[PDB]
Amino acid sequence: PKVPDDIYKTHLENNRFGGSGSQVDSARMNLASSFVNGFVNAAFGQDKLLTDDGNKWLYKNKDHGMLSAAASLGMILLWDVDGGLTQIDKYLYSSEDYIKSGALLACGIVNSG
Amino acid sequence: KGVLMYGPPGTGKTLLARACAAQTKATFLKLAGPQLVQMFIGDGAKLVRDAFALAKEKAPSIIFIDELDAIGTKRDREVQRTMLELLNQLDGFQPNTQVKVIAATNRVDILDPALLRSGRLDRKIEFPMPNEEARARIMQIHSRKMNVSPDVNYEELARCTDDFNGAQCKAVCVEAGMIALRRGATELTHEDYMEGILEVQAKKKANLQYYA
Amino acid sequence: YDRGVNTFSPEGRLFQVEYAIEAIKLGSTAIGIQTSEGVCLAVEKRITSPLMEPSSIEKIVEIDAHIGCAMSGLIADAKTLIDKARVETQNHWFTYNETMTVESVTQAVSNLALQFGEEDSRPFGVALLFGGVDEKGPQLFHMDPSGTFVQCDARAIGSASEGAQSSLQEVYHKSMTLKEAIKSSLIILKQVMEEKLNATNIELATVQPGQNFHMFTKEELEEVIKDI
Amino acid sequence: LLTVLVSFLDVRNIILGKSHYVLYGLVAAMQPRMLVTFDEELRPLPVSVRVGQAVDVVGQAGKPKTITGFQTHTTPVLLAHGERAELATEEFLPVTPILEGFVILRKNPNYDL
Amino acid sequence: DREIQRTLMELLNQMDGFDTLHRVKMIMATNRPDTLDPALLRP
Amino acid sequence: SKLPLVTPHTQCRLKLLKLERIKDYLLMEEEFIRNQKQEEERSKVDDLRGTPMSVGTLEEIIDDNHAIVSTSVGSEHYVSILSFVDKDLLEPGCSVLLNHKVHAVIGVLMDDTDPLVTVMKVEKAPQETYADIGGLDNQIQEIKESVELPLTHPEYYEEMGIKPPKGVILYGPPGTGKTLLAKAVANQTSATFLRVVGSELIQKYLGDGPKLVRELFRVAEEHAPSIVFIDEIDAIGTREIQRTMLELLNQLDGFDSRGDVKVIMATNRIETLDPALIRPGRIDRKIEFPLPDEKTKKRIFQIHTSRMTLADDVTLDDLIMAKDDLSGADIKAICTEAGLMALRERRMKVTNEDFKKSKENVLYKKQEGTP
Amino acid sequence: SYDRAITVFSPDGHLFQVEYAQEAVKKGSTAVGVRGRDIVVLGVEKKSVAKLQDERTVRKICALDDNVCMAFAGLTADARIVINRARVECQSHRLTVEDPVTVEYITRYIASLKQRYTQSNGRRPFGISALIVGFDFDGTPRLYQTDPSGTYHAWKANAIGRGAKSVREFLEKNYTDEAIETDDLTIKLVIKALLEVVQSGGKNIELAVMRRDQSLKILNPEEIEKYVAEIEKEKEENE
Amino acid sequence: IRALDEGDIALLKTYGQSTYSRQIKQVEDDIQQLLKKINELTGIKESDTGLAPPALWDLAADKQTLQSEQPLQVARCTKIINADSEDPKYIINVKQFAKFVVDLSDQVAPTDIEEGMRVGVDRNKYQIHIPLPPKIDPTVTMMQVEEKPDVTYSDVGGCKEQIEKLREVVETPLLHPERFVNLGIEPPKGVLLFGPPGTGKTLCARAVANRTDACFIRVIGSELVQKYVGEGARMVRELFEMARTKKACLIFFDEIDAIGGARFDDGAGGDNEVQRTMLELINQLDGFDPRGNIKVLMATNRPDTLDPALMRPGRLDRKIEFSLPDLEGRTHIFKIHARSMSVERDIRFELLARLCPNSTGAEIRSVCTEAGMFAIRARRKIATEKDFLEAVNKVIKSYAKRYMTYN
Amino acid sequence: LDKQIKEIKEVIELPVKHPELFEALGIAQPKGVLLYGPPGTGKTLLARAVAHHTDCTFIRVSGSELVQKFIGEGARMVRELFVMAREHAPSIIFMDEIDSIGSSRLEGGSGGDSEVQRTMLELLNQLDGFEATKNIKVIMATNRIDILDSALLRPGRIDRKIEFPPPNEEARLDILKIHSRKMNLTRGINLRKIAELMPGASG
Ligand SMILES: Nc1ncnc2c1ncn2[C@@H]1O[C@H](COP(=O)(O)OP(=O)(O)OP(=O)(O)O)[C@@H](O)[C@H]1O
Ligand SMILES: Nc1ncnc2c1ncn2[C@@H]1O[C@H](COP(=O)(O)OP(=O)(O)O)[C@@H](O)[C@H]1O
Ligand SMILES: Nc1ncnc2c1ncn2[C@@H]1O[C@H](COP(=O)(O)OP(=O)(O)O)[C@@H](O)[C@H]1O
Ligand SMILES: Nc1ncnc2c1ncn2[C@@H]1O[C@H](COP(=O)(O)OP(=O)(O)O)[C@@H](O)[C@H]1O
Ligand SMILES: [Mg+2]
Ligand SMILES: [Mg+2]
């Protein structure tokens, strides 16, 4: 599974936004990264970013990102209904509510098609 | 009023011209043959004439020409024009006054009939392949500042450096200094001199089965 | 300075027979090794098609029951040189009844090679390797179109002779058994020249002082193929 | 697609605003592009095929079968837009003479050695 | 190269303009007379 | 922009339907266009550049907004640069618009000089496609792997860490389709196509050869994704001409990084090529174009006779048969001359005998010599 | 130093004039010879009888021995010259040597003649190649080819001339490693090769057969057409 | 057969039509005419100008400067009269316009103005006020590399001695002048690179340019060879002046065989002009006046062809030989090329090296690439030893490529 | 030249005047015609007449004019000749005495040409590449066709050949009448006898 940062390949460009002015988990680019992880790693049933750091990455997003980022997992787990459906449970009972909304949509989006 | 100095490349031709500029205190005109070529048809004659006029105005003046064969080739058309202008601003219709020319080249066979006339370049100074003692003197001159070893057999170096030119001997000294650096030695020695000689020398081609 | 050997260049080199060395280069390679046990020659056929009879290409020949030959260059001129070497051996033996020294065979072939501008055609565009035995020692020799010849212990001629010669130089020493020298030659020819060994495009010929029979290697390469 | 595309008409409010999740509508269109060949048991059967663009050439109001500028690829192979594949050898017969998606093959009995 | 021939034409024309009365004379000096165009060499 | 390609060619109502579809769409264009602010920006800039504006050449840039400009009278002026001019679009030799009164730089003009290479930029590849060529499949895959795939999908090579191949030679008897294949690959990937015919780079002027090849590579790299074709490379391939060879070889292998421009070179006498120009480092792909075989010949006959009206009696196999005696260009010649022969006897529907005598006459005109 | 001659070498060592002789041979018509299990067969094509021409006079197949035969392809004047030399050599060898002629000896003689003709100034080389088939390989059939470079080789089956590139591959396509049983089968294969004629008609192919013990045998057009019919019947099996 | 009478073509193009002919050709003419109507209706396409992003530019400062400053003309200065040195007076040359006698402004100073010096001048008084840099020929100044290639010395394989000896001359004195000066030695100033094509000479030049840190100028044979006489010599003059402007500089000539050809005369004058250019160069490298801190690199495939004066030490002090790589060098370059790829870990490269004949490094990169295409055509994401052996076979047999002249 | 004029009328006029048939037939139009015959046999006259009637522009460049004294000029001049050909659009290109460059080339010695062949192969590429063959045709004339080579004659290249034999009795009559039409003849003139008394006239 590819990494959104690696798709951006910030490791090679001249990162002209860096040092002091990059040390924040700001909402917008985090939502972009979650969408990229969902799209690029869609249907492959696995991820390295939002599987090991599943809860942790969610904790650093905010507001509508939770409804988005969690649902992102559903695209990775496409048509393995018993795959995603065993993976969304940890978020089906999440303390967070917006990520619960994202997970409750990911459950359905896994069954799409 | 004309001195054509010549020899194989590697002798002291340009060095001797530079020394003459250094010591004679004259208003010295240094230049190379291609400088007078130029693009437009009538220009080359104009530079030649204007350089001679400037030499006239600076009266105690010396004109040095380097690489005659660039324009001095025997019979393009403009290079011919430039060298004709040089010929007649130097030999015909009241030359001399106090302008002296010095000429340097490696291909005297190329120039033949036009410039080499006794009237134009009165002296023809051959620069020979430097002699054994001459080669030793050249290496000593170039190695003065080298802080060489107190025992360096310059005679043996000259013996091994047959066919070597003065520039090649200077390269031998420089290469000996480089090899002394690669050893980290604070003063270069004789063995560095054979190593430099091996560096400067040719490749000896290869054994040719033709003759065996 | 292009018409023939009768013209001298400013450097003295005749600008006709350097092209004869280059004609040596265009030919397929040949390898020769001189050992105390025996003298061996290896040769590549450069076989155009299997429909060819591989033995029809006479790039490995038997000069006499005590001397074999390989060569590189032009095949017709090589065959003419081989024919002369054979008739020279025949005549000298029939007259004097003493064995022809291999060096003498090289001398005779070289003396023929000196017949393009030395009497009254063109240099023989082929270089030869001889491997023979005699009453005083087993020898290997090489000669070229120029008519010069030399005693070699391990020589390579023809196309890509440089790499094969370098490998042969690196593997050779004065105390090799003929088996180890042969095997080194085969593995070298396999790695650098074309491919794995096979009877269709490679040939071997060995000579021993006490063996005037079966001067070649034939229909027994099998034991090599599995154990190479 | 159509939901996402009509939504994007007010991108500041819909997508850049409150409703990023709307993008997930394209998962309703989620379909992979490939060829996978099976035998009649429906187990995978890797088969050499001829892949390339589609033109009619010598087909004028007739046969359009022309895989032009083709490569030889052993199945499975991905099929970008405009790509077509044809059985490289007639040793098989396809169940359906439209080689897109999952297809099944059978041994040709009419073909003889 | 072109202007050389154009001015040579002017040379021929102008010195063909010498009227018999004129007290003007011509001397040309050269070191390679062969290169000279035969145009001048004519009577 | 251009029209779509209608791909029935027989006169059928499918062709019609495609046509009136196109007419519908263009008529909507007409409708829409017939059924019919920034004055602040204009009033500042297009009034600062008070009409008229002269056209000159930029020589050097000295300060952030100060540059030297020459004009057609040849004079040189140190002038200022107004802020709206794109500095990155300015370089020595660039054509620049200037205020008439104060010669101030007021913008870059898109280049309209270097006429000859501007003409050889052609870009007029769309007359053919991989469709138009049949049977050259091995060659097609080879050139696709060498030049077409790195342009369309350099991702494979970058992911593999591979620097893509950087030179292709096509060779074979003439009329085998080398030029056609080059034009076809230029059509498949719409990268800019550059063609220059062999001897035409040989020039009387001493500099013009290497200079011409230098400017051609300069324009090629300027267009960035580009393919340059040198047909009959033999004319140069087999001191001055050798110096043009050295220039081309160094433009291929030498200093700097070339980037994306691909090189196709077609020869009829490949064995006469000098070793230097066939660089193993650069030219790793040599593609032979053999004389077409039975299958390829059949494909070429179908391709060329496809657009012609044919009778029933034509048995293509007797035309295909015998041996590999001829190439695709000869096949086109047979098709054309059979068309003329059918025309003389007043057939608009060519028959088998037409092709038979056509191939016979072509083989007569093919080669010559006393027995 | 380019070629310009016969006895000088290019700087890379190649003699260009022998290559030019090879090209002159390449201009000639097809000639495909084979040797079978016991018999040797030959078929020449492109007769092209020009109506007023009578084909027999040209003699595209010539026999110069008690038993050996084939012409030499290229320029037919050199072919007739070498024909006369082969007649003289075979008769002289049979008269002078204790035992009769063998195919290897005559092949070597022709190769040496070509070489000695090439190896001199002012002597134009014979630009003709040939395919020699003989009987006395100790009572076995065998085939040789002769190349204007003064060179000779021993083929199981070879082709020279206009179809040299093609028919050879055809041979490489189907020269059966099984020795051809019923050498009539090898003759049918030769007829199939002759179907690749310059005119490809097959109605004017001149064929010779010699069973390594027999004398020269000549195949008439009708009986050769019989083998052509058998080959066509074999070809029609693809249905 | 009689020629096509007008009735014959009429019936030919009438009887043979389908029942569609009229409609579809008429519709095609409507295609063309409607296209032309669309083109005339939309008008011509706006060619536009520069005009950087709108928020970036203008300000009233633009118009204020336009109406306040002066569009200075450019003039060659000459012959400072200096009649009394209280007001010196100067001569200026406005190209193809005129020649004037002028004075300085209230801003500039006499020390700021020299002879020549390419000064600027006002448009009506022609008073001199700006110090301008000299005219460097554009086709000479674009020759400066301005961008380092992505190659380091570690990418060069096998030639340890060659890279060491070349860095001794082109890199060490610039990096560590102290070693030479405190030992009191003058380092070499000219290095020639020679060897067979494709051995890595231009690669070594790229590595040097990447590690130079000083002003690096590439030079190609075609650049020097102009058409007009003396012009190439002129460009080399300007190039050496440019090199003198930089605090030290590196000059690289690629394939100096293009110009350095040995002088010959009997060929009806020969090329001559190329000889004149290389003669101006041979003077610039070492003639009158010291060259300066200019270290120079030449690489050529024909070392013997260059004129002996160019081979001469003092201008070409150190000559380096790039021979065909040895077995160890072949292994090293195979490693270097295989670094970038996605391959098997267990590729026994020294095997591939000993399969290689006397192959140049260009051949090594070629076979590595051919393995890359083998892997890609197989669609595998890992190149295997089988791919490398097919690549070796392909490259070697391709280079090897009737031939009955053999044995 | 009625037979010759009818053949050339077909080959040249029929494509330019009636392209549709070739579009209807699908075959590309023939590119050019070669003319051969003894000098003075109205070859240039006939080509000029065809240029006039088909309303296409006439451009003439002789093969002797092609040679030039410098390499790289014949190629340039031929390519730009076809540049004028394309920019004039419907036109015919004449190469009178193309055999001057379509001739035997020096096969080694104290010198060589190497540029006649180069101009030949440049023209050969230009007409082989059918460069914008829309209403553009080429025509060449050769004296004694035997000296010409088949390089330009190879099938996909120039397609048709025309022979211009010396005028016969009737042709001599026609030429006499045509040229003497302006002349002031006198009663008693019998041009038939003059035509008979001139066997093998060259026109
Ligand atoms: N006799 C000598 N004494 C001292 N140095 C010498 C002598 N001969 C040559 N050299 C050295 O040779 C180098 C080059 O000198 P110079 O330029 O005069 O050579 P040249 O023979 O005129 O060469 P070219 O004709 O190629 O310009 C100098 O560095 C100089 O020190
Ligand atoms: N395989 C082919 N398919 C279609 N047309 C071909 C083919 N080979 C040759 N041709 C015809 O030959 C011409 C191209 O000849 P080509 O070999 O490209 O010329 P060159 O030898 O100058 O490269 C075209 O007009 C084309 O119609
Ligand atoms: N010793 C080597 N180490 C690494 N790469 C090499 C070596 N030799 C050659 N190459 C590769 O082959 C190419 C050789 O080009 P090069 O020999 O520099 O051209 P030129 O012969 O014109 O100087 C380089 O691009 C380089 O990538
Ligand atoms: N059949 C003819 N009818 C009328 N005039 C002719 C005829 N043949 C030759 N001529 C005249 O002779 C001249 C021949 O010129 P040209 O056509 O250039 O000859 P060629 O083509 O052989 O060089 C023409 O000017 C023409 O007027
Ligand atoms: Mg000097
Ligand atoms: Mg005429």
From Swiss-Prot, chain B:
Question: What does the UniProt PTM comment say about this protein?
Answer: Sumoylated by UBE2I in response to MEKK1-mediated stimuli.
GO cellular component annotations of the record: cytosol; extracellular region; ficolin-1-rich granule lumen; membrane; nucleoplasm; nucleus; P-body; proteasome accessory complex
Q: Does Transcription regulation count among this protein's keywords?
A: no
Q: Which GO terms describe its biological process?
A: blastocyst development; modulation by host of viral transcription; positive regulation of proteasomal protein catabolic process; positive regulation of transcription by RNA polymerase II; proteasome-mediated ubiquitin-dependent protein catabolic process
Q: Where does ATP bind?
A: 7-14
Keyword Cytoplasm (UniProt): yes
Q: Where in the cell is it found?
A: Cytoplasm; Nucleus
Primary location recorded for the protein, binned into one broad class: cytoplasm
User: Per its UniProt record, which disorder involves this protein?
Assistant: Deafness, cataract, impaired intellectual development, and polyneuropathy: An autosomal recessive disease characterized by early onset of deafness, cataract, severe developmental delay, and severely impaired intellectual development. Patients later develop polyneuropathy of the lower extremities, associated with depigmentation of the hair in that area.
Q: Hey, which family's this protein in?
A: Belongs to the AAA ATPase family.
Q: Its quaternary structure?
A: Component of the 19S proteasome regulatory particle complex. The 26S proteasome consists of a 20S core particle (CP) and two 19S regulatory subunits (RP). The regulatory particle is made of a lid composed of 9 subunits, a base containing 6 ATPases including PSMC3 and few additional components. Interacts with PAAF1. (Microbial infection) Interacts with HIV-1 Tat.
Parent-protein start and end of this portion: 221 to 439 of 439
UniProtKB/Swiss-Prot annotation, chain D:
Leader sequence range is none
Q: Tissue specificity, please?
A: Found in skeletal muscle, liver, heart, brain, kidney, pancreas, lung and placenta.
Superkingdom is Eukaryota
Q: Which family does it belong to?
A: Belongs to the proteasome subunit S2 family.
Subunit architecture: Component of the 19S proteasome regulatory particle complex. The 26S proteasome consists of a 20S core particle (CP) and two 19S regulatory subunits (RP). The regulatory particle is made of a lid composed of 9 subunits, a base containing 6 ATPases and few additional components including PSMD2. Interacts with RPGRIP1L. Interacts with CRY1 in a KDM8-dependent manner.
> Function of this protein?
Component of the 26S proteasome, a multiprotein complex involved in the ATP-dependent degradation of ubiquitinated proteins. This complex plays a key role in the maintenance of protein homeostasis by removing misfolded or damaged proteins, which could impair cellular functions, and by removing proteins whose functions are no longer required. Therefore, the proteasome participates in numerous cellular processes, including cell cycle progression, apoptosis, or DNA damage repair.
> What name goes with this protein?
26S proteasome non-ATPase regulatory subunit 2
Natural source organism = Homo sapiens
Q: Where in the full protein does the shown chain start and end, and how long is the full protein?
A: 796 to 908 of 908
Curated annotation (Swiss-Prot), chain G:
Q: Where in the cell is it found?
A: Cytoplasm; Nucleus
UniProt keywords, alphabetically: Acetylation, Cytoplasm, Glycoprotein, Host-virus interaction, Nucleus, Phosphoprotein, Proteasome
Per the entry, induction is: Down-regulated by the ribozyme Rz3'X. Up-regulated in colorectal cancer tissues.
Pfam families in alphabetical order: Proteasome, Proteasome_A_N
Q: Record's Gene Ontology CC terms? A: cytoplasm; cytosol; extracellular exosome; nucleoplasm; nucleus; proteasome complex; proteasome core complex; proteasome core complex, alpha-subunit complex
**Any one GO MF annotation of this record:** identical protein binding
**How is the polypeptide modified once translated?**
Phosphorylation by ABL1 or ABL2 leads to an inhibition of proteasomal activity and cell cycle transition blocks.
Question: Which residues are annotated with the PTM Phosphotyrosine?
Answer: 152
UniProt xrefs under PROSITE patterns: PROTEASOME_ALPHA_1, PROTEASOME_ALPHA_2
Main localization category: cytoplasm
Q: Which residues are glycosylated?
A: 129
The record, for CDD domains, names: proteasome_alpha_type_7
Under the subunit heading, UniProt states: The 26S proteasome consists of a 20S proteasome core and two 19S regulatory subunits. The 20S proteasome core is a barrel-shaped complex made of 28 subunits that are arranged in four stacked rings. The two outer rings are each formed by seven alpha subunits, and the two inner rings are formed by seven beta subunits. The proteolytic activity is exerted by three beta-subunits PSMB5, PSMB6 and PSMB7. PSMA7 interacts directly with the PSMG1-PSMG2 heterodimer which promotes 20S proteasome assembly. Interacts with HIF1A. Interacts with RAB7A. Interacts with PRKN. Interacts with ABL1 and ABL2.
Tell me the protein family, please: Belongs to the peptidase T1A family.
The record's PANTHER family line, in alphabetical order, gives: PROTEASOME SUBUNIT ALPHA/BETA
From Swiss-Prot, chain H:
Annotated localization: Cytoplasm
Q: Which GO biological process entries does UniProt record here?
A: osteoblast differentiation; positive regulation of proteasomal protein catabolic process; proteasome-mediated ubiquitin-dependent protein catabolic process; ubiquitin-dependent protein catabolic process
The record's GO CC annotations read: cytoplasm; cytoplasmic ribonucleoprotein granule; cytosol; extracellular region; ficolin-1-rich granule lumen; membrane; nucleoplasm; nucleus
Q: Which InterPro entries match?
A: 26S_Proteasome_ATPase, AAA+_ATPase, AAA_lid_3, ATPase_AAA_core, ATPase_AAA_CS, NA-bd_OB-fold, P-loop_NTPase, PRS7-like_OB
Question: What's a Gene Ontology MF term here?
Answer: ATP binding
Instruction: State where ATP binds.
Output: 195-202
Q: Which UniProt keywords apply?
A: Acetylation, ATP-binding, Cytoplasm, Nucleotide-binding, Phosphoprotein, Proteasome, Ubl conjugation
* CDD domains noted in UniProt: RecA-like_PAN_like (cd19502)
What inducers act on this gene? Expression is not cell cycle-dependent and occurs throughout the cell cycle.
Q: Report the superkingdom from the record.
A: Eukaryota
N6-acetyllysine-modified residues are 95, 401
Q: Which residues form a coiled coil?
A: none
Processing after translation:
Monoubiquitinated by RNF181. Phosphorylated. Dephosphorylated by UBLCP1 which impairs PSMC2 ATPase activity and disrupts 26S proteasome assembly.
The family assignment reads: Belongs to the AAA ATPase family.
- Protein name, per record: 26S proteasome regulatory subunit 7
Q: Which organism is it from?
A: Homo sapiens
